[PDB]
Amino acid sequence: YNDLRDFLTLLEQQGELKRITLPVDPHLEITEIADRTLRAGGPALLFENPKGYSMPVLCNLFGTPKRVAMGMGQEDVSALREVGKLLAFLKEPEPPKGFRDLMPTKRLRGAPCQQKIVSGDDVDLNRIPIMTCWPEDAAPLITWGLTVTRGPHKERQNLGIYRQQLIGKNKLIMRWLSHRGGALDYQEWCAAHPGERFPVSVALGADPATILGAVTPVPDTLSEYAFAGLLRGTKTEVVKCISNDLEVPASAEIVLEGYIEQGETAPEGPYGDHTGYYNEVDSFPVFTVTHITQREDAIYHSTYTGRPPDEPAVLGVALNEVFVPILQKQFPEIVDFYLPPEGCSYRLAVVTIKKQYAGHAKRVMMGVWSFLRQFMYTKFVIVCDDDVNARDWNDVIWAITTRMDPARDTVLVENTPIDYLDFASPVSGLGSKMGLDATNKWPGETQREWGRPIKKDPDVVAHIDAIWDELAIF
Template sequence: MPYQDLRAFLTALRNSGDLVDITRPIALKYDIAKALAKTSSIQGPALMFTNTGTAFPLVAGVYGNRRLALKAFEATEQTIHEKVLKGINNPIAPVDHKGAPPCQEVVLTGDAIDVTKLPVPTYSPKDGGPYITAGMVVSENPETGTPDIGNYRFQVHGPKELGVFSAPNHRFGKNIAHATAMGKQLHGAIVIGVDPLTMYSGQVQSSDSTNDWFVAGGLRGSPVELAKAVSNDMKVPAYAEIVIEFTVDTNSQKVEGPLGEYTGYYTAASPKPVAQITAITHRRGAIFQGLLTGKPITENHVLKQIPFETSLLHQLQAQFPTITDISVNSSGGVQVYLVIAMKPRYEGEARHAILAAMASNLHPKWVIAVDPDIDIRSSAEVEWAQSFRVKPSEDVFVVDRTATAPLDPYTDGAFSSSVGIDATKPFGVEFPDVAEVPGWRDFDLPEIDKR
């Protein structure tokens, strides 16, 4: 069974030694980020900060490394893509929660609304202020009512105001633009602290017509329980820790940013729409959740990686069935650097697969195709394939004026360019055997095995 809520997952992490409680005071301004960067550097545990200077504890690092990600999916490296693909291919409809939802045990409206009472960290020295980074945003297409869930940033401007940023090609950004064109205010909710698979489902790449609650149910293998929001008609996860309901006012803008983003660079400050908070609801003893972003690799990149990889694998395998795996490298922000493992069926197929990947929603700058014998998550093995299976004049090509990845600091306006490298063995040509010592991994050598 999937974890019902964040608390169940945190219990599992604590029992396995993957969650550490920090009871001494840790400053929300910068020091939380320092602690998260340190545990991330050693592939360490998630951290629960119980002394935040507020009434709420703060947990972060929940998605801090691949080990914790696999634990959330209850999968291994060998089973993860199969499990996620099964979830994507078998969506499950949400259900209404029966009775009073836990996420509304405490309801704050009117003058009681004050988001500054939550332990919202300031992560980087040049950030424009405290940022909610682990919020799962629920919004709807204002015309069709199709719900979208995704991870977006919000800057705390004041007790009832948040700065809004969503790239225009993302569904939340499209919903804001659509509502503005219709002369409507967009209602939304920031959901903080949900079960891990619902959080991961917000990263799955899908069409604008997809009801994301079905995707979440598929990944969980059971329906998400939803409850009606307090100040609008939207549905939110019943077991969320905290829900911040809002309307987006595009006519009222304030300077938002900078923020150290997934690219590893600060995004410039600029006027952006304001979210007016209409209600805050939470569980008793609610746990706030943080998420470190910035120079790769951070928790932000780990959260995206498995859903991004499996989404793209799902899309490309329909056209190229001999693709066995895809790596969307964390060092490229889980966006601009892809490695594809495949066995070409005909000369030029690897190039076709590379071009299809370039046209995907990730907008990568670098796409490398290798044979399935290459470990695509080992930079050394990929570099080996590039070194000795590539004839640069024939196997390396550049496609100009490709779409740019969001927030890429080095692009030509709305366009970029992409490099394709076919590092598969030449098709139909006899190639030398690999000089590798067979069976060494299983060789019994107690003299060093016990070290």
């Protein structure tokens, strides 16, 4: 509720947390245990005996949709929809001047995240149990922790999740993939104040809300921290940094302050990410840590990415539950909107609508590839009717195979924008998308007598639904 600690005591009570006092190595061993754990439901893991470190390593926190929901003050995967409704409403708060005639950040003075402090001369990052994920990974990599930066002229600050490679006792690599967020504030600062070092701060182990707030996309009409307030219920308590004016959550577990030396870059050695493949070496800015501030008995929050199901993959499933309502408000025909993890969290989407006229499927298609920005890179879209479970491959494959004619019902559009790292494309940043509607064809779409689908009896599915537990089948 207020900070991570409280979230873990809550989870531990609800059996959602497990403590591995046994000796475990943060060098690819924690991943293995976490992987198996996440691959089977599993609670959040808290290793308090990392081989060679004093900081317990906390991972797989949002390894279940349930826990993701809870982290947003909802305690119900379904409730996420309410968060979608909110997000929509936040976009248009006030009307234009023409017809207009008709949650602040609580800054504290002291903060537990500044209980212990070390700077410059002695800021050994080697003391932190930063973990290595896969055997061919370059080096230890910070995976969580929200990076905080500020523009050269905008008062508002941004929270970003960028993985950080350990290249020195006090140097990390700042991998700002996007052309927005922290990456924008930097290329902008370089303009306004060329040569002068760019201030940067990373907060590890903040309250679930500030974390999830940084994850969920929010309208520019609201500050990241602000959103966290609505989710949490109360205003988020931040605190001034030491070497800069940036603001980091006061309850954070560990906070890294430093800067980015204009021009200083470094090759981000190979790393395996959500796709399940290793990223090829690339150059990126290097973060210089001049200050490490933490709590007493602070725990290190960390995660990993690999072939899905992934820690982030599940976070995305939980996060897609919030977009559904935002998507429906736009296309009331949409019943369910789902993006299976196997499809790398965003590469494929299944949409089930209530078809009300021939050709309808194509509209939802274009809709998905254009409406929200988080679905511009998905290259596969399957449109189905409301009598199929978008989340059950048996239902979807049935639809594809019974109510579809490949050549006739497939829509291929070329030269669309695509993820720069999607090696499977013909050219970096440019590829094709495929839409396949498997909706019942209406007269016009077909000249044949369509099949009468088997529809279960509501009362029966309801009766055995109650007697089910009495039938000790499992």
